Symmetry: D2
Subunit: 309 residues, 4 copies
């Protein structure tokens, strides 16, 4: 009995996540969407690559939540972009409705699953998925930090002229203005990044990381990033499926860590088959902690709007 | 000095091909398109996946053929779908113009490259690319058969209930009506496919292979297949870069094989760093040869229309 | 949780098999041997390679069968060496005692395991393993054919000038004089090997395959082959762990197939999570049957010697 | 054409390194040894695994240096074993003669190669290799630090309860008493190791790392480690062949870095197609410098013994 991964929402992120996972033979994959034909087509297309690439995975597309039953991991990409005229609460509302509909159908069919959210606003939707599923909180998480850390690591590897395999970095919070950069906690083969890159340039790289998603949006003209978001999501799925105990920034439920309670927030975790197996507590200095507290206030504000719906 | 692969046309097939190649660290990748922003965005997005996936490849996007210089392989996906009102010659004409423009700019900058075409009509455009580049014909080829054989192999593995790693198949010709199926030349770990699958069902699978591209089109609603076409293209690129001597059906220039002269046609080849290193001559029976001759007449008809432009 | 594989016998074959399973992150690995220190040493050495090779599995060396409990697959490599200069009968007696000691201790601790034997004489020892374990016959198999076919495929690829990835071959029986070669059931991308290689040369390749183990012994002057034997064994382990439904020659228990009853014999099977999920019955011609019947007589005589102990 | 790697010394380390390079299809491999039959045997065994493992590279065993011509990398593993019970000085004399014979024959045949030494005493033998070859110093390096760091990272990952993929560590000097441990320059996803592991336990881990080679020797009772030593060596080979710009400790020729001149010593470098492309100069504190200075004195004394031969 192979592992089973269901991916909800068969757009660019969801389908690319299926590609990364299939390539590694990580388990059978169900791609689900509301639109008829689209998940069926992408799934069959990917499956037809399998003799070339040498993986034995069933990739199927479906419009029926029944086909997601007994999944080991559920990935949710479904959501709604904002566009003009919408208020903050309007954007939160439409995504909350989408998230509730997905989780309320999927979770009871896979009571042992780890749920990985990849929609927006990420921390709030992960908080909602935890409420709706009623799963142990360790088993409901969100992907945000692995992507931002990946962009940062790319920029560092680029600038320092070194292998991307040798750059590691931790950060916290959400995306853009809510990101909590922590360049002190990044290294190249154990050596502080700040020994390779001077402060002014490092600050530019931190800012580029903040703006990294919008950078891609501006280039693509239509649509958002998907190759790296899907890679980040897939690395998380892998950590769960193989119990790898990866140390990653992940949206997790806090019970006093960093002085925060009753909130999902991007924090360093050990991630394995149990989901969040540890929340790590970094010795942040006053400047770093000021960044965290400001981000947590913003994340709290979004969460309060969700609760008031 | 890492290998260098340029991919012309940064749509679904071109960008997915970059993904398959990057994942295998096969060389630095240039993604080129006429549209500003789009190749830049997809390329940077893929590059930002690299610390997660562990590959050291430069992936860059560009609108400038100068950036393609000194490539080891050039992949061309650019072309034009037909839609209504267009005649046969009209469709051939617009793709010929696109193909000429791509090859005339790219080929002189990479005089040692192998050119791999993945546009339509595939055999005719490959014939044109050979004329325009003036390269040795062994170094100008087209991807068609690896995809159709992959779909067939998937269907066989599905039906027989066996690993896709154990199914192998040769076929000839082009796509759909121009495909020349050869189920006699397919095996599961050395054992004829016909020992696993009875004639009526095997005929259904052959027909499904013929219709395999349109199957995906019908499901997707908008757009065509890309995961498997890109995998096929990337496997060909790999064969060249690593001199693997893969035995594959490929659109190649014929000088008497199967009784055909002065034509590109899908035939079994040994594919390596020299491009086509051998054209294999199968002992086709009368029924198989009748299929080939009918397909070659159709491919000839397209080629004659190209020549008359 | 993670898959678990126990490998009994920490010699070259056992240790090299462990390396393969671990590199691929196929499961936690227990390496057991009677000699204190040796399995612990090899396991720790392999484990210390993990941050370089990027795998997260436990690799335990042990002298205690208790550490093998609840394994998904048991591999047995323990066996008297070299065809040591004793009688054929002496070899069977010493290996029967080893096999009985190994299986009687390991089997009760892993009642749902698939057992894969890799000692000598291969078919007889697999028969004894079935007897001692009491397991369903589908779950006790022997590795022999995958190695012999690998050597054959290597020789074929080299001679035909093609990729090893494109050569398939089925064969039957045991090793050496007991191998039943089947060049009719071998192909290159679905094309008969006989179309590439002339009959005299092919006969040489067949003979080289029979003598292939001894060719390696003679070169080394001390010890036997282990790289290809371990790869063959690991591939079978993988087939079970990932439920891949590989089509392979393996030593299986026969109940009438090919006219053979109450015997282990190398036959084509579908191998998956259930062990042998199907024994395939090839339409062997008169010549091929003569080879098989002679092979079986010899395998029977080995088995009868075992039964008379 | 394909990359070419020659590995001198067909023992456990050389043969296992070959296995790694081939599995990854990194280039054609030549395994050379003085003993007739042994390298031919090991090479053929490895080659016969290729259709199972899916790699297309040539794997040649030889007694003739002519077969190593025009290699991209030369790996030297040939060396007197075990710290054999002779004097320290005896060990240097025997290995100096072996190293001189190896380098004087191989270097002129591959004038553009990078040489990677893996014999003992490591720094001295790499110094001698530079002398005998006459190659630019950047192209003659020794593998030691990558192994010692791998053992350290293994121990750290196990103790902290995290993925080996997320642990980085830099260290300097040679093996054993000459290792310069640097736990300050080690991290888990960019976070200082000191935050995870208490000082007393970390000190134990450091000592285990110093004794790590001997720990393996004592368990095995015959022979030394080879899995992790070969992985470390292969990773360095890969860094050169794929121009990955890895940041690694390697034995490099010093001209003033860390106060050291005219000596080979384990230092952090950027390693790529050009060999050592940069020697990094860490801001070592007073305590760390004392370790380094003592290490250097000892490495100097080994070197002076070599110079007095
Ligand atoms: Cl231990
Ligand atoms: Cl040979």
């Amino acid at each position: 009995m192979r592992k089973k991964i269901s991916i909800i929402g068969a757009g660019f992120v969801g389908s690319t996540t299926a590609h990364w996972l299939a390539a590694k033979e990580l388990g059978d994959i169900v791609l689900l969407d509301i639109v008829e034909g689209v998940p069926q087509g992408k799934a069959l297309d990917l499956y037809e690559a399998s003799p070339i690439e040498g993986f034995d995975v069933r990739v199927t597309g479906t419009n029926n939540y029944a086909d997601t039953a007994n999944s080991d991991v559920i990935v949710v990409t479904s959501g709604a972009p904002r566009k003009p005229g919408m208020s903050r609460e309007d954007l939160i509302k439409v995504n909350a409705d989408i998230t509730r509909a997905c989780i309320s159908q999927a979770a009871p069919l896979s009571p042992n699953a780890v749920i990985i959210m990849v929609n927006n606003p990420l921390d709030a939707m992960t908080y909602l998925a935890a409420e709706v599923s009623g799963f142990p909180k360790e088993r409901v998480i969100g992907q945000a930090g692995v992507l931002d850390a990946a962009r940062y690591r790319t920029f560092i590897a680029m600038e320092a002229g070194v292998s991307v395999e040798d750059v590691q970095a931790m950060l916290m919070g959400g995306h853009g203005d809510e990101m909590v950069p922590l360049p002190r906690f990044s290294t190249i083969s154990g050596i502080p990044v700040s020994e390779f890159i001077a402060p002014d340039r490092l600050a530019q790289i931190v800012e580029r990381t903040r703006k990294g998603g919008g950078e891609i949006v501006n280039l693509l003209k239509t649509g958002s990033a998907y190759y790296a978001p899907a890679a980040a999501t897939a690395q998380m799925v892998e950590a769960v499926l193989k119990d790898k105990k990866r140390v990653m920034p992940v949206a997790a439920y806090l019970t006093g860590q960093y002085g925060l309670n009753d909130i999902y927030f991007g924090v360093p975790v050990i991630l394995g088959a149990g989901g969040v197996e540890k929340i790590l507590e970094l010795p942040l200095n006053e400047e770093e902690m000021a960044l965290l507290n400001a981000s947590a206030k913003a994340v709290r504000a979004t969460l309060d709007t969700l609760k008031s719906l």
